[PDB]
Amino acid sequence: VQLQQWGAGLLKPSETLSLTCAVYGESFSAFSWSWIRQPPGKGLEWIGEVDHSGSTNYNPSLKSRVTISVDTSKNQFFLKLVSLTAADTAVYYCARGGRKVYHPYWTGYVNNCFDPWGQGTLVTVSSASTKGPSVFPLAPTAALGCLVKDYFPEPVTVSWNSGALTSGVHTFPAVLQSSGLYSLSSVVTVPSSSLGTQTYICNVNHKPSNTDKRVEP
Amino acid sequence: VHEIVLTQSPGTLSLSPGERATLSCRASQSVSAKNLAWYQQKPGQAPRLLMYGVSIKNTGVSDRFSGSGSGTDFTLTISRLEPEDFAVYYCQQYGSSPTFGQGTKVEIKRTVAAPSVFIFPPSDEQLKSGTASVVCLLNNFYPREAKVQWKVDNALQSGNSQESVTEQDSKDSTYSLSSTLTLSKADYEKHKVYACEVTHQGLSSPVTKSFNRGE
């Protein structure tokens, strides 16, 4: 059993998210199929489920905006989320739910736990366009760093002294600002006596925009 | 249609290898039959079905995992913790419309370490750019729980600061935090004194780092 996932992963607010999950290997019917999402650094949230007959069930938090459809001709099922906001940025997984069980007196789905899972599609909702980062020095055991602000999209690679200085380096995760762009900080702790003799340069490379900052006391 | 809220305890379980871990899942209303599951998620990976039917392990799951409980109280037990087991664990109920718990992190335990607090004012180039960012850095601390408060001329600021935290390091098993306070150039040049106050378990008294505009 294999799950393939696709769909646009970079959208603007007040737009429609459309994702597709295709299953290979076993019988697409006799199984519930669910969409789940996970915001970056947060917990799992069940979005919805569908079966082969087209009957759906949704999370009450997303009932107004979510629509889950099915296509048994292609063994696929689709997710649609209208009126997007920054709160909808998340990794979206599809998963196989429970098995349909038939008895002459009762029929229903049992063991509605999720396995296997799709690879997961990251979706980012923001009105920002591709912009290069601005690198500002955070001047000074002494701590010193570089602030990488106003860039889009992820990621950005940060090194120190062309990769020489690696111990004591802390590169935090990027934060999505309200403006739609990202901000980041890279810091490093050094001996106080090296501040006068040794030079410190943060090498910041953002390949989406194809864009070395010296930090001075 | 039946809505069931699952709360996991504790939020963070700090244990050492070789010990046993006990995670609890409380349901606001009874979970029917044995319709509960546990999932394991490692950093930057897809969730993994760990257990279903309260106590039935999935294929390829070691004997060190055990499930128990019923009604509103459920438990996941890890007999001997391995370096692999340190991750996030979620409980999920499927007695009604499926719902997830908020998750419990099993992490490496170490000695309490106090953070080193530093403050960075905005660079003059950034001031000319039209925005100001003040950075408050908390370096090497344990446990993760720490409180950062911004004060601009003794005024408590809210809604204009953003935090970021690194994952527990592989060597010293510590955390690092950064709090960025973002202002406009006018709002920044209006006031003068900027401070961040850090409260932590390792600090006997809240440590405040401040600077005056133009220093």
Author numbering:
A (entry chain B): 2 to 82, 82A, 82B, 82C, 83 to 100, 100A, 100B, 100C, ...
B (entry chain A): -1 to 27, 27A, 28 to 94, 96 to 213
Report text from the authors:
The PCDN family is a lineage of antibodies isolated from an individual participant in the International AIDS Vaccine Initiative’s (IAVI) Protocol C, a longitudinal study of neutralization breadth in HIV-infected individuals. The donor in question, PC76, developed a broad serum response targeting the N332-glycan supersite (also known as the high-mannose patch), one of the key epitopes on Env, which involves N-linked glycans and amino-acid residues around the base of the hypervariable region 3 (V3) loop. All thirteen of these antibodies have a cysteine (Cys) residue at position 100 k, which is located at the base of CDRH3. One PTM that has been less frequently discussed in the context of therapeutic antibodies is cysteinylation, in which a cysteine residue in the antibody forms a disulfide with a free cysteine molecule.
The resulting crystal structures of Fabs PCDN-16B and 22A showed that their variable regions (Fv), including CDRH3, resemble the previously published structures of PCDN-27A and PCDN-27B.15 In each case, the CDRH3 loop projects away from the center of mass of the Fab domain in an extended β-hairpin structure. However, each CDRH3 conformation is distinct. The PCDN-22A expression profile additionally shows evidence of a fourth isoform, in which the first four N-terminal residues of the light chain variable region (Glu-Ile-Val-Leu) are also excised along with the signal peptide. In contrast, the structural data did not definitively confirm cysteinylation on PCDN-22A. The crystal structure from the 48,500-Da species, which would be expected to be the cysteinylated counterpart of the 48,381-Da isoform that we solved earlier, showed no electron density corresponding to an adduct on Cys100k. Considering that this method separates protein species on the basis of charge, such that increasing positive charge correlates with longer elution time, this finding indicates that cysteinylation of 16B appears to confer a greater positive charge, while the same modification somehow has the opposite effect on 22A. The reason for this may have to do with the initial charge of the CDRH3, where 22A has a higher net positive charge in this region than 16B and is then shifted by addition of a potentially zwitterionic adduct. Also, the effects of cysteinylation on 22A and 38B function were not tested and could behave differently in these antibodies from 16B.
